Write a protein that binds this ligand. Structure first.
Ligand code: 7FC
Ligand code: CL
Length: 332
């Protein structure tokens, strides 16, 4: 028969308890300012397709960033704008400053606060053990906030995490794939980026929830402490599940598919093979031994689980002993 149902363990019904206007993004009507108010200064690298520029707000001469919206459905523009406005002021969420259009092209664009980011590739090579705990904790604050606001990010990855390393400031960006969580709703599995896709996406299980972002977060933790980046390096969506199964084990994969009555694409049986669940200690060697603590492995083991419902929530993750060194006492 069909796949078994599933529900988020936390924040499941929060959107139904809010006004419909909160989550009914198709009824949202943005106000499009004049993009001429922001003089572009330099282009900022965001892939071969997305066009993002640093600019100056000539009204107050403040640094901003302008993201020209790729030709996509207006429905998806409204979704991203509504989600950004619902999340504005949240901890470590990128602040949407303005929604503008170019007077000539009429192309919609988003204006964000500027953060003096350093690209993760060079940053990951110099992060200390404390840096990893600190920035993972700051990222967890953003994920717990947006989940508590009934929103899945669905594209968590190092490229979408701006870090001002000198100011110790972090922002979660790129909410163009984010969605509102509603219990029993089936979602598109063609989300996130290959290396950070959870097993539910790869096996085409559509009734997923906030725990998808927690798998992606676990992949980032694994690449930071083990220094293998990305940690699961699939050549495509099919091979990506094999890379996961070579670590978590194939028998545990089949146990997950049986629990939720998930039909496996038979092509996976051509490439999966049989693999035991590996101990996380097997990935330690001289180049990463200084970053792989007992609590780091215990947290990673509780994040990188096939069963999305058994993964730690963002809040449970924040309460894990791994973050004890960075849990600050209440101010004032
Ligand atoms: O799509 C989005 O939601 C989105 C949001 C923000 C940014 C964004 O990128 C930056 C980059 Cl790539 C480099 C630098 Cl040096 C600074 C910034 C920055 O300040 C900034 O806000 C990019 C995309
Ligand atoms: Cl606005």
């Amino acid at each position: 028969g069909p796949a078994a149902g599933s529900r988020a363990r936390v924040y499941a019904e929060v959107n139904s308890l809010r006004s419909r206007e909160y989550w009914d993004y198709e009824a949202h009507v943005p106000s499009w300012g004049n993009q001429d108010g922001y003089q572009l200064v330099r282009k900022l690298g965001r892939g071969k397709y997305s066009e993002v520029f640093e600019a100056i707000n000539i009204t107050n001469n403040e640094r901003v960033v302008v993201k020209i919206l790729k030709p996509v459905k207006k429905k998806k523009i409204k979704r991203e704008v509504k989600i950004l406005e619902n999340l504005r002021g949240g901890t470590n969420i990128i602040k949407l400053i303005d929604t503008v259009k170019d007077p000539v092209s009429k192309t919609p664009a988003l204006v964000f606060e500027y953060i003096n980011n350093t690209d993760f590739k060079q940053l990951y090579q110099i992060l200390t053990d404390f840096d990893i705990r600190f920035y993972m904790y700051e990222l967890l604050k953003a994920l717990d906030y947006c989940h508590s606001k009934g929103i899945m990010h669905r594209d968590v990855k190092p490229h979408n995490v701006m870090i001002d390393h000198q100011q110790k400031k972090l922002r979660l960006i790129d909410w163009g794939l984010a969605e509102f969580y509603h219990p029993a709703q089936e979602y598109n599995v063609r989300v996130a980026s290959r290396y950070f896709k959870g097993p539910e996406l790869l096996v085409d299980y559509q009734m997923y929830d906030y725990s998808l972002d927690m798998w992606s977060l676990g992949c980032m933790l694994a690449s930071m402490i083990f220094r293998r980046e990305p940690f699961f390096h699939g050549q495509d969506n099919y091979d990506q599940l094999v890379r996961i199964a070579k670590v978590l084990g194939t028998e545990e994969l089949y146990g997950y598919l049986k629990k939720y009555h998930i039909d496996l694409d038979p092509h996976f049986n051509d490439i999966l093979g049989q693999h035991s669940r590996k101990r996380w200690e097997n990935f330690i060697h001289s180049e990463n031994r200084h970053l792989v603590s007992p609590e780091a492995l215990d947290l990673l083991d509780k994040l990188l689980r096939y069963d999305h419902q058994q993964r730690l929530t963002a809040k449970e993750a924040m309460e894990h002993p791994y973050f004890y060194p960075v849990v600050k006492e209440q101010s004032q």
